[PDB]
């Protein structure tokens, strides 16, 4: 009787949600048939066994949602929560926020209302979408607008797969990412950056697979989100609301851009060779090598940090290890948060998904941090925008739909002030 709603807009969202619902069906014992031989957070019961998950699936390119509709989970998802237009967006914002998107966002709103009226104590939203995309950026921004204007009190935890500053899957990412950032910053309360590259380096070092694919990255993201929802899913000594997250991790109304980390993530052999104590694991969780957002946190000072533990985890060693962390030297907090840590334990140890490169592991910790290194990301990203708008490139591709041009400036202007933000709050007093 305390549930979540998850939305998977765009191409990144639908893939990561595919893997994540695979994991969730694996955990709660729910079979691909939708029958089961705890689920009230995600799933819902249709009277007799055959359950349906609380989610909507939006991607106007009908290809990936077709790959779902014919996949191993054809029987599970509600045949009406699979919406897709008859065209694509092509990585520009206006193609998914002004003209094309103007069609199905109302259908999404109707479906969401007809899901929520069935909910009892719905806590938070969980959208999944890239910003470099065309339909996960525009349509997602419009849906965020509609949600933030209708319901209100509910938290809105988005999980955006930002593009790394180095690698690129498209050449117009800066535009429709600046636009997404500026259009969500006024209607979100959480935005955890999940770079698509740091996970590659992770799989290269902790897992020895020099050739990883989107499947393994999505499995890892599913693991993170499952470790997160482990609070509501099953019990534990420290059950924490999801509304806890928007309380511990929102200092000021404008600076709410967290980054996450997960530990431990190892193969079978390393687990055979390793100790995996509480101190060791909460020490490794702080290393920069496993920050989902590709950053160097030493470049800045933290502001808030929340840690969800699961497995055979003794609280006394928890307190001792976090104390030693706060006395460690390389990290640095700021003056205006002497209380920096937040903890929450659960007795649901992680799952060994068959074939998943991850190995069976007794303990786990997920660390979501509101930090200051993320700021510099914008800088480098703003970098790109400079060289792109110093020549008025691709503007015609945007005006060829109906989105006014001057908006660019505004959006860009906003991010400029954004940098000012992390030079006004990051400064001691």
């Amino acid at each position: 009787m305390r549930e979540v709603i998850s939305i998977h807009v765009g191409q990144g969202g639908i893939q990561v949600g595919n893997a994540c619902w695979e994991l969730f069906c694996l955990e709660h014992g729910i079979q691909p048939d939708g029958q089961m031989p705890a689920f009230n957070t995600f799933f819902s019961e249709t009277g007799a066994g055959k359950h349906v998950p609380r989610a909507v699936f939006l991607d106007l390119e009908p290809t990936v949602i077709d790959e779902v509709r014919t996949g191993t989970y054809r029987q599970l998802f509600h045949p009406e929560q699979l919406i897709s237009g008859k065209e694509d967006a092509a990585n520009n914002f206006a193609r998914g926020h002004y003209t094309i998107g103007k069609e199905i966002v109302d259908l999404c709103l109707d479906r969401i209302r007809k899901l929520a009226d069935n909910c009892t104590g719905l806590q938070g939203f969980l959208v999944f979408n890239s910003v470099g995309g065309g339909t996960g950026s525009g349509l997602g921004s419009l849906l965020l607008e509609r949600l933030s204007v209708d319901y209100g009190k509910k938290s809105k935890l988005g999980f955006t797969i930002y593009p790394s500053p180095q690698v690129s899957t498209a050449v117009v990412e800066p535009y429709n990412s600046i636009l997404s950032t500026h259009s969500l910053l006024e209607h979100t309360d959480v935005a955890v950056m999940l770079d698509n590259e740091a996970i590659y380096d992770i799989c290269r070092r902790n897992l020895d697979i020099e050739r990883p694919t989107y499947t393994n990255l999505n499995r890892l993201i599913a693991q993170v989100i499952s470790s997160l929802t482990a609070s509501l899913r099953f019990d534990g000594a420290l059950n924490v609301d999801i509304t806890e997250f928007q309380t511990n991790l929102v200092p000021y109304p404008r600076i709410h851009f967290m980054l996450s980390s997960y530990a431990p993530i190892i193969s079978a052999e390393k687990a055979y060779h390793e100790q995996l104590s509480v101190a060791e694991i909460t020490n490794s969780a702080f290393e920069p090598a496993n920050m989902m957002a590709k950053c160097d946190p030493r470049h800045g000072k933290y502001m808030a940090c929340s840690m969800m533990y699961r497995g055979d985890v003794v609280p006394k060693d928890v307190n001792a290890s976090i104390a030693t962390i706060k006395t460690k030297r390389t990290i640095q907090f700021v003056d205006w948060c002497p209380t920096g840590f937040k903890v929450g334990i659960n007795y649901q140890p992680p799952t060994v998904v068959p074939g998943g490169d991850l190995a069976k592991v007794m303990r786990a910790v997920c660390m979501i941090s509101n930090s200051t290194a993320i700021a510099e990301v914008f800088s480098r990203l703003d970098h790109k925008f400079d060289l792109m708008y110093a020549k008025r490139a691709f503007v015609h591709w945007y005006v060829g739909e109906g989105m006014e041009e001057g908006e660019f400036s505004e959006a860009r202007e906003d991010l400029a002030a954004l940098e000012k933000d992390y030079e006004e709050v990051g400064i001691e007093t």
Binding site: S267, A268, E269, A271, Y272, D312, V352, G355, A359, K360, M362
Partner: protein, 69 residues
Amino acid sequence: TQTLELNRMRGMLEDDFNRKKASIRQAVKEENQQLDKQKRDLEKQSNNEKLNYERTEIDMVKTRGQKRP
């Protein structure tokens, strides 16, 4: 005598709890040992299969002589 009857209670319960936890850890070690065989064997199968397929490909390519009409 009562306090000894109780201290032996504490001792037996603890020296059972610890052996049980160690047994759990050994079972997890065995589970990881088992999981290792999957990545030990699937890679061997895929290697042998690539060998066979690419050898057959080499054969099919080389099997192009001359026509001489």
